[PDB]
UniProtKB/Swiss-Prot annotation:
Tagged with keyword Hydrolase: yes
Official protein name in the record: Ribonuclease H
Gene3D superfamilies assigned: 5' to 3' exonuclease, C-terminal subdomain, 5'-nuclease
Domain of life: Viruses
Top-level class of the enzyme under EC nomenclature: hydrolase
Catalysed reactions, semicolon-separated: Endonucleolytic cleavage to 5'-phosphomonoester
Native organism taxonomy: Viruses, Duplodnaviria, Heunggongvirae, Uroviricota, Caudoviricetes
EC number: 3.1.26.4
This protein's UniProt keywords: DNA replication, Endonuclease, Exonuclease, Hydrolase, Nuclease
One BP annotation, GO: DNA replication, removal of RNA primer
A GO molecular-function annotation: 5'-flap endonuclease activity
Pfam families assigned to the protein according to its UniProt record, in alphabetical order: 5_3_exonuc_N, RNaseH_C
Organism: Enterobacteria phage T4 (Bacteriophage T4)
Function statement: Plays essential roles in DNA replication by removing the RNA primers from lagging strand fragments. Exhibits 5'to 3' exonuclease activity on either RNA/DNA or DNA/DNA duplexes and endonuclease activity on either flap or fork DNA structures.
Length: 299
DNA sequence: TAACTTTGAGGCAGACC
DNA sequence: GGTCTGCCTCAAGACGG
């Protein structure tokens, strides 16, 4: 079904990439209490109410082709194959209950819903989002990344990229200067939440530091310069700051995603198996989502 | 067969020039 | 004065076909 009133948008469809493993996990985290067994219906409801919410925003803004991007670390992330400390990061909440449940729901989404579910074992949600934004932003589409992950601010260098934070209800705003600079900060000073260290210390600094340890100060001057001429990495830096830098690029700058990976992702997506706008009504019932049939053209 | 245990922002301390 | 880093707390779900 699509007999409509959809006010004058654009040929090159507006697209909404959704950092899935955010909106589900961190919604579960604020919405579900301490050690009480998190059950599949608790999980499912959350995920669909959360999809609905977001989609309304996405569809009421110009963005119509929705994509759900999921972390798949089953065989280990590629970034973690290159650098074992990556996101290794070093309970009364039912982690396991939430997880076993959400895998089930993912499958159902792949199965019964109108969304490209980008999930490829070994690639992160960030890869899907980063890559697909590069492709389409250049191809003429308008893009909206739904996610509060500051790491995506580097993707704002690309035209017609806006970002919404599902949690805090603001627009994610470019943070000091340009995105080129923003990227170069996480490159040089590293990214604590991702376990990426400054280029002024060892690789696995965050995963191995002894107490007392501090990262040597990194002048902003150096950041701004290099950001404006990455040829300055060779001058402003030591030989080992510079190698640490080359290693941080892979880990942080999305431009450094292997090409092979960017095809593998776009291949999956071009050829994705999108199911019929009608299996929706028979999954709600299948599962127990009675209360939802009555608002469904909302997807 | 496998693993995935949020996010930033706003304070506040101490080290450096 | 100012800049840099690290640590600690905080608070974040929109059901007319």
């Amino acid at each position: 079904m699509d007999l409509e009133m959809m006010l004058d948008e654009d040929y090159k469809e507006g697209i909404c990439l959704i950092d899935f493993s955010q909106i589900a996990l961190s919604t579960a985290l604020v919405n579900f209490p301490d050690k009480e067994k998190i059950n599949l219906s608790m999980v499912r409801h959350l995920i669909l109410n959360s999809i609905k919410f977001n989609v309304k925003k996405a569809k009421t803004l110009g963005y119509t082709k929705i994509v759900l991007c999921i972390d798949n670390a089953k065989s280990g992330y590629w970034r973690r194959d290159f650098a074992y400390y990556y996101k290794k990061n070093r309970s009364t909440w039912d982690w396991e209950g939430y997880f076993e449940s959400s895998h089930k729901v993912i499958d159902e989404l792949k199965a019964y819903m109108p969304y490209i579910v980008m999930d490829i074992d070994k690639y992160e949600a960030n890869d899907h989002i980063a890559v697909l934004v590069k492709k389409f932003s250049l191809e003429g589409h308008k893009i909206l990344i739904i996610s509060s992950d500051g790491d995506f601010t580097q993707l704002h260098k690309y035209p017609n990229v806006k970002q919404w934070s599902p949690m805090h209800k603001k627009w994610v705003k470019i943070k000091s200067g340009s995105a080129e600079i923003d990227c170069m900060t996480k490159i040089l000073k590293g990214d604590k939440k991702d376990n990426v260290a400054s280029v002024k210390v060892r690789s696995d600094f965050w995963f191995t530091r002894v107490e007392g340890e501090r990262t040597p100060s990194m002048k902003t001057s150096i950041v701004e310069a290099i950001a404006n001429d990455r040829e300055q990495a060779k001058v402003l830096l030591t030989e080992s700051e510079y190698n640490r830098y080359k290693e941080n690029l892979v880990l942080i700058d999305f431009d450094y995603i292997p090409d092979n990976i960017a095809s593998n992702i776009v291949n999956y997506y071009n050829s994705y198996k999108l199911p019929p706008r009608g299996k929706i009504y028979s999954y709600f019932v299948k599962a127990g989502l009675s209360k939802l049939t009555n608002s469904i053209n909302e997807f």
